[PDB]
Write an enzyme that holds these catalytic residues in place. Structure first.
Site, PDB file in Angstrom:
ATOM      1  N   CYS A   8       0.794  -1.228   0.000  1.00 48.40           N
ATOM      2  CA  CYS A   8       0.000   0.000   0.000  1.00 48.40           C
ATOM      3  C   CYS A   8       0.828   1.281   0.000  1.00 48.40           C
ATOM      4  O   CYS A   8       0.310   2.356  -0.288  1.00 48.40           O
ATOM      5  CB  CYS A   8      -0.961   0.000   1.183  1.00 48.40           C
ATOM      6  SG  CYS A   8      -2.141  -1.353   1.096  1.00 48.40           S
ATOM      7  N   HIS A  16     -11.382  10.267 -10.730  1.00 45.66           N
ATOM      8  CA  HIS A  16     -10.292  10.325 -11.708  1.00 45.66           C
ATOM      9  C   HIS A  16      -9.155  11.248 -11.280  1.00 45.66           C
ATOM     10  O   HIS A  16      -8.604  12.007 -12.084  1.00 45.66           O
ATOM     11  CB  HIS A  16     -10.835  10.645 -13.103  1.00 45.66           C
ATOM     12  CG  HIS A  16     -11.461   9.463 -13.773  1.00 45.66           C
ATOM     13  ND1 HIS A  16     -12.772   9.097 -13.564  1.00 45.66           N
ATOM     14  CD2 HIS A  16     -10.946   8.546 -14.625  1.00 45.66           C
ATOM     15  CE1 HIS A  16     -13.043   8.013 -14.269  1.00 45.66           C
ATOM     16  NE2 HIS A  16     -11.951   7.656 -14.918  1.00 45.66           N
ATOM     17  N   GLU A  37     -12.601   0.770  -0.089  1.00 48.45           N
ATOM     18  CA  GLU A  37     -11.481   0.779  -1.037  1.00 48.45           C
ATOM     19  C   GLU A  37     -11.520  -0.407  -1.980  1.00 48.45           C
ATOM     20  O   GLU A  37     -11.113  -0.292  -3.128  1.00 48.45           O
ATOM     21  CB  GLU A  37     -10.149   0.759  -0.296  1.00 48.45           C
ATOM     22  CG  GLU A  37      -9.957   1.966   0.583  1.00 48.45           C
ATOM     23  CD  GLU A  37      -8.555   2.070   1.140  1.00 48.45           C
ATOM     24  OE1 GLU A  37      -8.053   3.213   1.237  1.00 48.45           O
ATOM     25  OE2 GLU A  37      -7.969   1.014   1.479  1.00 48.45           O
TER      26      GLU A  37
HETATM   27 ZN   LIG Z   1      -5.029   1.566  -1.380  1.00 50.12          ZN
HETATM   28 ZN   LIG Z   2      -8.641   4.405 -16.017  1.00 46.34          ZN
END
Ligand SMILES: [Zn+2]
Ligand SMILES: [Zn+2]
Ligand SMILES: [Zn+2]
Ligand SMILES: [Zn+2]
Ligand SMILES: [Zn+2]
Ligand SMILES: [Zn+2]
Lengths: 118, 119, 119, 119, 118, 117
Positions: free
Chosen positions: B25, B69, B108
């Site tokens: 991570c 994004h 996540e």
């Molecule tokens: Zn992550």
């Molecule tokens: Zn993408």
């Protein structure tokens, strides 16, 4: 703040105290899902309650006993309902994950149980 | 009580700056993040709802567009962009414009998440 | 005929270098990428499978580790890391070790992806 | 042809694999929430607007479904080695005689792992 | 080959007019429909894709807006709005605007759908 | 300890009190999901609070009225929002299942409501 992590395991079981015709009294199985929920203070430096990796590692021995196994053979799971299983998992995991605040078990996609220590 | 929720997903990069040397991570990576905004309150007798989902969408939109994004670490407050920090951060941005907000959940991954309730 | 498939998900960052200047996909971002590996072949009458899922996983692992929790653009061959380029790249990496491989699907989001079949 | 109809069913069952090496976890008694997709290909009827009525597909599959659901697969003749592949073929052999337009059977043992049989 | 696909969901009402009296699908009801558009073609060496998802979305938008939050039976061509009829109708609406369209899948429910290739 | 069971039903509805031109005011529909939660003591012998089949059996009549129907035609559902529907389901089911502790209805994949009496 509460953190949670989901695990899937593939197991067989049968319910021993249902009527003779009852489909769940037959030998069968499920793709079980279990969610471990932990509640505590988030550390200002790490920015988490604990590492998901440490939760995984703490649960692994209990996970290994459940996955690709027949549940009725495990002590405590002689009547392996969702409710019984959820409490059994709490009893195994709570001593090694003190921040554990709930265990949810899903027997199927549409059916499950949540235990909190009550 | 009555609680309403709406889920949103955003596609973002992040990295965790305060993890041990090898930790996966700590590398530059990303997720399809899911956020659930939970609101609690009285349902109006006429409309039959607590709020219009369109009001909720509109109120969340500026925060959503900073997240989607994007690379989260560039956002002030998200220098350590864990699920926990992120849920609180989203709460801190959205609570002032959605007073009835009662929880923020961020996931996540499909299997890993955090719920924050203003405490 | 009989086809076997196995899905894996990896958490990665990428950006598309050849989109117009404002395009959101040109920004540094990421996804929970899903990859499906399709295998087509004869069922062995002893084992009762085309291949063990565990062997497919073991064969894929090196490639999987290169993708997961990584930034795709830094990997040689993924300088333009679209779903289509990624699906072909995975095929090229995996086919040598899995000769029965018949397709690679890559999904960037829950609603968007592509399938490569070796041409 | 042009049009293919499909219908998914889920059944809860136990099995074990008899021909895997001693250690293998799939050799142990276990189970899955199996998913089965039945695919039918044929001409759409100008009047009904469908290839077949899902009610008739249900009824034709029901006897086979009842044998699989909440059962131990290894006890069923033909499923002594109850891999995904063997199961999909077995289902095809039971259902094809009563659903002539059956074009494929897919079985998934898990949400990430399955196979497709086409005759 | 390489095939790209994009999924959309729309919330609509319909009823089937040519089923026997009493059939539940003959009643006014609705679904969270899902439509997958599949496109097959050559990957451009510069863009690295077959087409931009945004061009596809914009091409489908007019048709999407006729379907979403609407009653399907009122739409010309959807008087018998089965999955099969709907998939072909979508194809017939979209193919002229998306020449590389290779398939349309529609799912009425999580467990039921069809695929059309014109 | 809490037990839950999910059901899906395919229905039409429309919202009568939204402004002119609002999409939800048009005739439309959803694949609705409903989660019934029940809270209570687990019996030491059966190992459950209740049999899922008894809960299925208790909900069936109400389920029958919702599924493959137009919600606005059902008394109490003339304004069939998620919030109204959740409370309505609670009012139908609570008297038959007294351990019922919550009803969640999901109108779509991403939107829903939880009612707790
Ligand atoms: Zn992550
Ligand atoms: Zn993408
Ligand atoms: Zn069971
Ligand atoms: Zn198995
Ligand atoms: Zn319908
Ligand atoms: Zn609606």
């Amino acid at each position: 703040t509460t953190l949670f992590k989901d695990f899937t395991f593939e197991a067989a079981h049968r319910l021993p105290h249902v009527p003779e015709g009852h489909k769940c009294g037959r030998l069968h199985g499920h793709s079980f899902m279990v969610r471990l929920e932990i509640t505590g203070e988030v550390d200002p430096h790490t920015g988490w309650i604990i590492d998901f990796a440490e939760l995984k590692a703490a649960f692994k021995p209990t996970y290994e006993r459940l996955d690709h196994h027949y549940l009725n053979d495990i002590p405590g799971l002689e009547n392996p309902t969702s409710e019984v299983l959820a409490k059994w998992i709490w009893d195994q995991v709570k001593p090694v994950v003190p921040l554990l605040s709930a265990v949810m078990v899903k027997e199927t996609c549409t059916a499950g149980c949540i235990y909190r220590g009550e």
